[PDB]
Amino acid sequence: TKKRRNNGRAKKGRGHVQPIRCTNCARCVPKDKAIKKFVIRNIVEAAAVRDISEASVFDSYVLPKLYVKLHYCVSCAIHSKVVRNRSREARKDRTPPP
Amino acid sequence: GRMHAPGKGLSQSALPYRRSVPTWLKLTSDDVKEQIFKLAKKGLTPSQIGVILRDSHGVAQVRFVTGNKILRILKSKGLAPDLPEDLYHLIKKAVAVRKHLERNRKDKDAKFRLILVESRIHRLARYYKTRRVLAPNWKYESSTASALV
Amino acid sequence: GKCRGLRTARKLRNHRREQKWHDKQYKKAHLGTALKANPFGGASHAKGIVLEKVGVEAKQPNSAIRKCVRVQLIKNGKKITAFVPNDGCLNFIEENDEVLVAGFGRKGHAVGDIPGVRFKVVKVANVSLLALYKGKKER
Amino acid sequence: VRMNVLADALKSINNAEKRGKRQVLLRPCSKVIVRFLTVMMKHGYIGEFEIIDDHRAGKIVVNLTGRLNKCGVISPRFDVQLKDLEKWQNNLLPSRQFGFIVLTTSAGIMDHEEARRKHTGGKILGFFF
Amino acid sequence: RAKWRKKRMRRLKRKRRKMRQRSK
RNA sequence: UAUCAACUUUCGAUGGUAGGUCCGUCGCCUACCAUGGUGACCACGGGUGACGGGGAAUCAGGGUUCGAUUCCGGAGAGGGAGCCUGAGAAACGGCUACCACAUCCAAGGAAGGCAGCAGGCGCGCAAAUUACCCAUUUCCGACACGGAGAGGUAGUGACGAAAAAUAACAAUUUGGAAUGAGUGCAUCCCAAACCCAUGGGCGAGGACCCAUUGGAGGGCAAGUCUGGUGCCAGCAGCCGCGGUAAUUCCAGCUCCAAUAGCGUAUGCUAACGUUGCUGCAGUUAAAAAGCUCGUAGUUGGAUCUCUUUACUUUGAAAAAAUUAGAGUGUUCAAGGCAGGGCCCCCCAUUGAAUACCCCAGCUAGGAAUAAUGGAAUAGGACCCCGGGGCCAUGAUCGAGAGGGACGGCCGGGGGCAUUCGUAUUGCGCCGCUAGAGGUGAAAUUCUUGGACCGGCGCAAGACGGACCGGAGCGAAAGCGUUUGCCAAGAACGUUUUCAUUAAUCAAGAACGAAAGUCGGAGGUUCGAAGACGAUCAGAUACCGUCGUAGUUCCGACCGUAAACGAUGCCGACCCGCGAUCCGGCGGCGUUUGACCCGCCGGGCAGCGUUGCGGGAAACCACGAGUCUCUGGGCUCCGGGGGGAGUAUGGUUGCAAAGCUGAAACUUAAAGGAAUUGACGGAAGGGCACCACCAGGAGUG
RNA sequence: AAGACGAUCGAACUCGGUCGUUUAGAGGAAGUAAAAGUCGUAACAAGGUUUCCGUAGGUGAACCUGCGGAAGGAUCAUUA
Ligand SMILES: [Zn+2]
């Protein structure tokens, strides 16, 4: 039976999209079917940002961040706990989790 | 829907219920004929004849003032060609497509469109033959059509 | 959808003509096959000579030795397996004698827990097997 | 692309009647459609329809009274005689008490009871009950 | 896997052609 | 029946001329000439358990099947061929041959055709008596007379059909009372006999003058009855019954649709709307060709007193029988076409009819629908008198169909050439050092021949990220770095132009991801194959190192994908809202088109209601709605699951294989959707010193 | 009258071509029905390497892998 109206991808009005590669498994995943995850984290951890702050030779220097664009396949986005298996009625919620 | 194209677009003319001529038009039945004559001899198709008259001289429907349309006027005088201008541009497009295919060989979309252009030519000529407006021996040949443009 | 046009009597007739062949019960009765492969050749009964007395084992989940006989037809020389219907009537079967076999219920289909036997013997030695089972026509 | 104007006419009436509408707009008009509505209006299934007299195919706005159950066409227009007219009555009408089959005899468009009284058959257009 | 039933079938048909080719 | 697509003639195939021939026409034949005739509207070829029809069976309607079979027509007399006679035969219950078969011979010869009536053999599942007679019915001749196995009658006959016993009236078991079936005489009947039918006579109380056939678990009306048989024997069309308390089987009783019939096998019909024209299905159960073009075929926008076709009505025709069916008490009925009553009249010189007979042709109306068609260089309609006059002098459009022009565009549409960005990999130099690669772990491998790592670099080949979205474009496959070149396309705009030029489409064709194939270049990375390293009981794998073909480009092939929206195209109708895409339109503003509020037209989609419908449900407004209230048009395609996309044939291809495509046989399920449990090596939450943390005892 | 030339119709026979149809065959290779015996675990829960399509190669065996797909996936969703 058809589990999702969009078949688990964002292909509407098209016949084929460019496949991209995953991150933790390097699997060819379509661009619209990829599990996008824009990771933006500091270069230094919050537990070690104070040691780098006092060692900074300047007065006020904002530590930059790691802007990483990750792609996950369905089999890995669930194993990595990026996405979960929701209820039959909960799958229709396209709102990003807070 | 379109003949050899998808989509069911609706963009055409709507003639109003007024089967008359607006009073603010000062061009008589003979003055408009001279405008069609002076421009058809200049190398302008009847499709281009009504455009310039509508947009510069303000013509609405020559079929109301005159008992005949632009086609039956130029043919009664002898200023319009034998083959209609609609089929003329159908052959002109195929010439550009053929010349495009002669340089670019692996353009499959241009070759696909070439069949559609010719398909409308044969369907139109099939209506031309049964209407006695074209000779029954008239046949579109892609080799000899280059000089017809 | 189906063509409903007033001049589509030929299109409708030829379509139904070629689609009836996709029916199993129609194609088996309107082709050379299923008639020449049929040992009876389109007959209800047939006579034959008892060649062997073979006991075929029933299929799962049943367990019982179905008593049949390997009979060779006289009309075309084909060898079939007629099932001895009643109980203990296999002993009433004589060796190398004439038996009038007939179909076994379903037409050309094995009946019950028997694997492939689709024939049953009606008469034995020019007399009915049912009488031999009910103490009549002592032969 | 149309292949029938009476089919799209009675299809618009049948849908608007079931949707509870009081008036239905029929985009194409024709003398066969107008005489078809007259047979229904004469028997009390539709109201007074107004023909929009345009210099084109023409439009018709029918006043629906809700008394109609369904109006449909029989495509193609089969040739119905008088000996087989009783057959079409059992296949298209709900019962022998009501419902009419619109035939096109040589005397014009009429129902099946009028064609039997006039003792003449013709081509069948549709039905209504 | 129905695809390997098609893989073994094309492999059996290809062998039947070689047996039928040597009987020419 | 296309796994028969082209066919017919170097001997007639089509037509033309003349002639021959025959009763007569004709390529019927001959001769001279033409290159014709038929064909996707299915010719030709093949098959038929094919004589055709009238009809039969079954059917609500529509249909399906059957028709050797007594009537009509045709065909044949073992297979052919050729003749005689006659008005009529290519006759065979007449000949002449050959072929097949076979009889009598004295061995020289002669004589044979039961698919006529009986009968025999054979064949088989399958089908009567070497019977009696020209009376009916009629037929043949010289005919009142004679002849008829044509026919009539009887025997055999459970093909089948119509009537109709095995009691009844009583009693609480015995009384008569009523009648044949059977059994024996006349008469009738019959050409004689025979079955009857009739008159009396002889004729039943366990009225023994006796009814069986499948059943009794369910479907499906009838017993947890009785006993043994114990997954054995068996029962069972299907599901299923037996592994020592069987409602199934092996038997009794009893009971049940029954019934002089009743089971079984097979064909066929309904059941079956599981062949669907009426009237089915193709999102997920079997299924819309990957996509588009395209002829034949099929169906085609609106517009005319409210030239010929198709269509409807009427009559003759549209054999009889049969059927429907008026009429008639064959004791009734199946049937028959014949008879109730008054002493030679009386159903008014007793009957008595009719319908149906499809289709086609024929006969007399109507003019709705759908075609067709009369005037555009008017050889125009009429009247004049080959010149004029005369007419309202002759062209409907402007599709909520389409083509094209044209304007501003728009878009990953396509071809080709350039620009750029790195990265991976390879190499050189500079700098420091011993491990590095990789893995869950390990090892292969690279390494003081400087690996890995850092910089400056260099070279080659792929790729074109993030922007990039449930956004666009294209018929689909598919398409996103810059710039340039090239010719297309939808939508929108339009009082432009053309004026039904259409839609869908067997046959045919373009294109068609990837892999593969042939021929070159280039081979970075990846990487079929392959080697090796690990793991395991075993890995010919996943993991790792390395790497051929391949992956990249160029041309010719291959035409296959879960080519999917698992959902054909066109058209109408049928809900709402907020967004989004292109174009157009009109409105406060902000900003030098951008943004804001709307609206009209298509495009991808979404949400809500489907509890205005649909569906098995999941779900469906790119309808999967307007479907028993069934018919808008068209194409393709499905008929339980397997066998099997196999065999074979044709065909395409270099090959791999593509298209087309079976059967035997096997099977009672396969499958779809949904639900409750269980389970997961899935996720989440929660709980207990038989968990840990913190320790404390003790075990080992 | 027998008989004979020639023409014509033409059975039939001896050889061939073609079509239809019916059958033998050493051997080879499948299908189905049995018992499910051996081997391994391919699939069904993340079936323990997600499944599956097309294609190709390889492998005792189910299968493995590459390339391009599809969700009938365990994702209808992942943030300026
Ligand atoms: Zn991935």
Curated annotation (Swiss-Prot), chain D:
Its main location: cytoplasm. GO terms for cellular component: cytosolic small ribosomal subunit; nucleolus; small-subunit processome. One of its GO terms (molecular function) is structural constituent of ribosome. InterPro entries: Ribosomal_uS8, Ribosomal_uS8_CS, Ribosomal_uS8_sf. One of its GO terms (biological process) is ribosomal small subunit biogenesis. Disruption phenotype: Morpholino-injected embryos have a thin yolk sac, bent tail, and show a marked decrease of erythrocyte production. Signal peptide: none annotated. It is found in: Cytoplasm; Nucleus, Nucleolus. Belongs to the universal ribosomal protein uS8 family. Component of the 40S ribosomal subunit. Part of the small subunit (SSU) processome, composed of more than 70 proteins and the RNA chaperone small nucleolar RNA (snoRNA) U3. NCBIfam families: PRK04034.1. This is Small ribosomal subunit protein uS8. It comes from Danio rerio. The lineage of its organism: Eukaryota, Metazoa, Chordata, Craniata, Vertebrata.
